[PDB]
Design a protein around this ligand. Structure first.
Ligand SMILES: O=C(O)CNC(=O)C(=O)O
Ligand SMILES: O=C(O)CNC(=O)C(=O)O
Ligand SMILES: O=C(O)CNC(=O)C(=O)O
Ligand SMILES: O=C(O)CNC(=O)C(=O)O
Ligand SMILES: [Mn+2]
Ligand SMILES: [Mn+2]
Ligand SMILES: [Mn+2]
Ligand SMILES: [Mn+2]
Lengths: 456, 456, 459, 458
């Protein structure tokens, strides 16, 4: 077994989804310690991990897998696959319209075009598990792109991305050039950059040839470009996460709610503006030393600083967790998780008819996995959003939730916060035995709960 | 000659529109001094002014004007005129569809229905001038409604408004009851309230019978109601201003831009959120004791406070100023202002053809009026927005502006700031004399500038 | 007094709105008989009427009025006034944004630009009455445009319009050239043409210099162009009507309704298409010799012909009447009509209080205010009376207006509509009772759609 | 083997997709002759075929397939599966929200709920093939629904559909009742009816118990209802076709085009209406004896009849063909078709590069992949070839797909579409240049619309 197949087999043996995610990330950057990586290198500098083992990723994704996909799946150009090339300093996109059959894709490849698969997790169960598990320790959606570049060519123009990137070299070799942010405003850039020319760049802070097994990481804002040497092609998978997951994004959501709450709860935010402020505020008064401006600006600073007191921080955290649920890949269940939940509940047939299975107050249970559900308050109501009905295709499924009544709130929170400890249904903090069985049965039937022993 | 006609005649002799505005407001609340009113009563207390002069408002509006309006104008029910009556603690609306002809209106009036004209200024040139001048010293759109209530009746249920109200008793008398905000949240209310019942009310802070010439002012949020006693009907005009012109409103517009600027200018606002903040933030963690929760809360509060430093106060002031220009009533020119502008340039048919002079570098000029234009910077471009082409009907006319080029900005701002001081064209700060003439000419032709002496 | 002022004064003394319309049109083309005009010249030939009377249109509109309007009204460039110039064979438009003040307009005029007023009826009460009266005999909206061209210039490039035009020369002179439709597809054109060049034209079927008082008429599809002589300016008003009022426009509305009816009422229109018609129908089979192709074609033709039986002709006629009412200018009342309608009913005042209270008795004589102000229309299974009395002089500013007519009143409503201008006594209205009999009459009177033989109150 | 598996094996050996479709329909209603069926029964009468063979449809769809689907596919309630029951004369729908897991579905079934699968063809390759082939001889979309009703119950209230229905009894038995259209307006109804009550129904024209292998056909407008007798459950597949495919539908699209063309080409349609027709036309005037009213009416009928001469029939036929291509299921290729097309072209990856990477020459012999996968359509002064090869098995999931055919290629395209399944040498295509012959053939082959007589990768 290769290291990748080995660790995946190991993951199936780890009862907690939280621990499985920590383990896979540990494996991803080994031998570098995760603690050291997040403390000093995450979002700060480019990092190269020389693996010394070309088989490290064997089983994750290969060119034969790409070929098999184009033939047996409905892979579309533009929607799923891009064909591009960077020749004569110009970025070209040769995307024919329609389905990307093997004959077409490979003809483009033989003509020097690079092929980029936009959603491999939708077509590969191994990439799916890989991302589903890693998204849990990033606390942010984890996507991927697969890049196949033919010998002696470059598929893309230098540029920097709007996400944190992990480059896994799968096949062949490729010369990579990584540059530090060119200016202060480019550090941890908010959006993807345009295509740059060789003249827009300076001296790379990291230039190296990657080999199968190696890993190259760099923060958003770091310009990069890669090319294949003589005779050897290159296949790599880029793992991306942390798209617009900043303090500023958190603030953009909290501010309108904070002002709204301040206006409704405090008369000072309700008082009228001065009748003559238009006489000293405005671009045509920017050079003015009018004492009225200073007082006006001083009031703006004081009111804005107040707003902190009215900021609904928990509500915004829940709104972001809800969007995370919506963006998430559905879970990959271990053999045990499937066997102990409604997914592995057998239906016995006799005489051509199904003959069904009930939880009791003695049944011990806990959440299917740690990152598949979230309690969210909306419009004075409580809703439990979940990922178990999500597609492997990004946003193909709309947000899924079920209403949690006030009486069940305490028990629901207990279940979400005590994973993976088993809890008897009869020990749930509800006002009646009937309420305990009701909540447990609802969660179990929806595939959100597992039992210590199979129900049947 | 009534006091009103007296002051209007007086305003026609005052050179500055700014002085005219201050003079008219002083007149409106005489003998109470403006300084005292704005400093202690405005947005704070209800105020009554026993004029002791039934002729104070003669010339402003009368029942004869209303009657004449229905006859000679296209007054429509719903859009222009409402009919209502308050019987048995229940608000009624008897609005027939279509035009409100005298016969139909007076018929409803006889049935005990009150009549409410929604936009008097569109039909009465005096009310128009009255509101066009006052809007200048309020620094906010000033509107009005005329109420005609038949004897022994009440047209409306008790309620509070979302604007500052000035009630001018025009004919007859009416028993008015004004109440202080019922609760902190209702003080300076953001929106109009629903219809209240006598039970939802306590003791009125002011109960009085108004008579012709009297003035009754009260802040948004003060519930009120009025009724006519046996034997005399009532006609009054309510002047309204300050609709959604609060600090909260200023903040709602400034914050989104502030965070955006903060994220682009300071890397701290671009840093990634913790990978695990969802483990301790959110409704399901409201009682968590994790110290990271407290640190997260404290960080949000400091980031919010710091946003004030990035708030584009001038840009937002210009946007509100631009909206004020759009919402403004067109200017009412004095006899001499008209005689000195393009609106007074003599032109006819002579010899069967147009008679058709031009302005030179020795011509003294200054803005037509003080509150008719505003320079706004949008998308790296100077725009001069104006009110001169506005309709007396609210928003009937779309926003109107004139693009200003860089080499003319200083000259424009100078003209806007030096009102009403005349300035010879040659003294304009411009690159070539062809620009001093170009600018002065364009402004004169649009009806935004006047000359020291008839240019013809 | 000018002929125009003299005919208008006369119209005020003509009680029937239908007869007034006929009289004004008669006056418009005098001495040519209306019967002859419609029977042989309407939609067929260009017609010139040499009035031999320069003061014929005096009072309708002048350059003085145009000046006054720009000075007192909110005239906007593009919206109400256009500034054009046709020089070097090219058509240019110099419409600056914003209000068109006298200073700007006249400056453009002095620069050789022709000025065109798009809606004179909204600003001139005389133009308004003229069009309000003529629309009734055209049975189609009547609009107008005013044109003022400076000496020695041409404001517009040759072209043809999508409406029937009547050119009234008001001031100065102008050389007109009218060409007969170039090709068969241009005869009675449906839409306006682009700007043509002198090269795309042939020989005029009528060339003449119009002078004040003259009338020039030409059908849609006839190309035309005009130029001003030396030292003399030109002012004329073009009366227009019949925009999209063709048999085809009628068909376009009736067809979708006919198929729907045929499909719900006759199973043959509900039967399935052949399973294999795609094998012989379509562009890739235009050369097929399969006999099923000919049979298919004949089948379509017979089914189309058969829709005629399911065509709701009356319903579509009411719908077109409804739209005409929506496009109509509000009526212009005679002294008498006003004096006998709600618009002339006085309100008595006592102690600064209206006490006028005068209802309609069962012995009142009444009839529709005018003959072309209302129309009964059935929709969604109900009856509605659409009217024009609340329309604005500005095209489509006012939305369609109507009041519901209940089944028990239909007969009485059709009686009044079809008996104008004959006075009918309320008590004789075929209603369900005397109550409903008085209800109808009062409602109609209140909306300003009915008049009484004697004023209900003397002012 | 089962009759079904035997006929499907037979179709894999039949060269023409057109013949394959005729053969399968013949099999579907055997022993009844198709000619007789379309001539006297189709859209006219309910038909019962007593097969006397319980294994006739063996292999098409079973309860086990349904169970396997619920467990291995993302079957959603509402979107993919319905759970209903007819109790006390009232129709009930017990569709919970979300995914339809086996546990949830079987519990409802146990509670007396019938289960209906809305798009079997998306989850079963056999049903897909069955419908893809039959749509070709219907000339209209062929859809299907699967109904599983538990013992002793009725799932749906009596009603009639807006499509032609073929009921295929798969497992168990079921008592069916079919009624003749109640009134003239309901004959060949255009839209589905609401739920009816037993009181609205008269006497059945057809009442019988269906057994595995039987076939029950009935036109749109025929009310029907069924229940499971005490004892066994029932599973059936209903094949539907001919939704809004009537002469009236053809007319609706052609009329506006006809008037537009008539007005543009004939002055009579451009002449003005009378200035006073409002005086004698309209509801108020329906009684009027005005002779002008008679003439007006006659002119409308005359102008309407003249419209036929201006009806663009081929243009409307192409638009409907275009919609048919859009609603079609993608083709199911025989082994030979796949092996002779781009789909079966060996270009597999090995040695670290693309191996076995075969071009068409003027010597190559070709013909359309199948007969019902493409259609030439004229739109806005241009020619487009619409095709079905990239359609999803899910209705309308994929947008309309086409490629532009330039005027210089029109003749060659029509030749290929019209000479199927005869082989034509690329060098013999009627084009203006040799390169044009190669260019068209290569483009069509690469899109999966053409096959070659011999594999290109020899
Ligand atoms: O591989 C290349 O040519 C470009 N790759 C990337 O931009 C990436 O992996 O994010
Ligand atoms: O006059 C009345 O009955 C009520 N008036 C008002 O609410 C007002 O003037 O704002
Ligand atoms: O008067 C002109 O120059 C042009 N006139 C017209 O096009 C017209 O009256 O319809
Ligand atoms: O099976 C049932 O109960 C009802 N079936 C149908 O309506 C059908 O197959 O079209
Ligand atoms: Mn990149
Ligand atoms: Mn109020
Ligand atoms: Mn014209
Ligand atoms: Mn059915």
């Amino acid at each position: 077994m290769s290291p990748l197949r080995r660790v995946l087999a190991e993951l199936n043996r780890i009862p907690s989804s939280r621990r499985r995610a920590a383990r896979l990330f540990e494996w991803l950057i080994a031998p570098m310690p995760p603690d050291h990586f997040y403390r000093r290198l995450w979002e700060r500098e480019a990092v190269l991990v020389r693996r010394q083992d070309h088989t490290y990723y064997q089983g994750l994704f290969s060119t034969a897998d790409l070929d098999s996909m184009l033939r047996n799946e409905e892979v579309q150009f533009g929607q799923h696959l891009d064909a591009a090339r960077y020749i004569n300093g110009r970025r070209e996109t040769l995307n024919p319209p329609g389905r990307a059959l093997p004959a077409a894709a490979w003809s483009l490849y033989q003509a020097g075009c690079s092929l980029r698969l936009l959603c491999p997790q939708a077509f590969s169960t191994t990439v799916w598990q890989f991302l589903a598990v890693l998204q849990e320790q990033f606390g942010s959606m984890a996507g991927s792109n697969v890049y196949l570049t033919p010998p002696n060519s470059q598929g893309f123009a230098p540029h920097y991305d709007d996400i944190e990137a992990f480059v896994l070299q799968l096949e062949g070799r490729k010369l990579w050039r990584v540059y530090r942010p060119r200016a202060p405003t480019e550090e941890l850039a908010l959006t993807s950059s345009p295509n740059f020319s060789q003249d827009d760049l300076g001296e790379p802070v990291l230039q190296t040839v990657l080999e199968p097994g190696d890993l190259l990481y760099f923060p958003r804002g770091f310009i990069h470009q890669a090319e294949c040497q003589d005779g050897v092609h290159s296949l790599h998978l880029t793992l991306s996460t942390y798209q617009r997951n900043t303090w500023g994004d958190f603030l953009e959501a909290i501010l309108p709610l904070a002002v709204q709450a301040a206006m409704e709860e405090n008369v000072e935010f309700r008082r009228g503006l001065p009748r003559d402020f238009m006489d000293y505020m405005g671009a045509q008064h920017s050079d003015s030393k009018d004492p009225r401006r200073t007082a006006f600006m001083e009031k703006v600073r004081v009111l804005v600083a107040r707003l902190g007191h009215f900021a609904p921080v928990d509500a915004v955290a829940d709104q972001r967790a809800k969007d995370f649920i919506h963006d998430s890949l559905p879970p990959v269940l271990t053999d045990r998780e499937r066997a102990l939940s409604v997914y592995g509940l057998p239906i016995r047939w006799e005489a051509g008819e199904p003959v069904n299975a009930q939880l009791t107050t003695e049944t011990e249970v806990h959440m299917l996995q740690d990152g598949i559900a979230r309690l969210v308050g909306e419009g004075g109501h409580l809703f439990l959003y979940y990922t178990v009905e999500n597609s492997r295709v990004y946003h193909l499924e709309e947000p899924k939730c079920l209403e949690i009544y006030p009486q069940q709130a305490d028990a629901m929170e207990l279940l979400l916060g005590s994973y993976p400890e088993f809890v008897r249904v009869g020990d749930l903090p509800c006002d009646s035995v009937e309420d305990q069985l009701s909540l447990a049965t609802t969660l179990y039937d929806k595939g959100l709960l597992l039992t210590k022993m199979p129900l049947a």
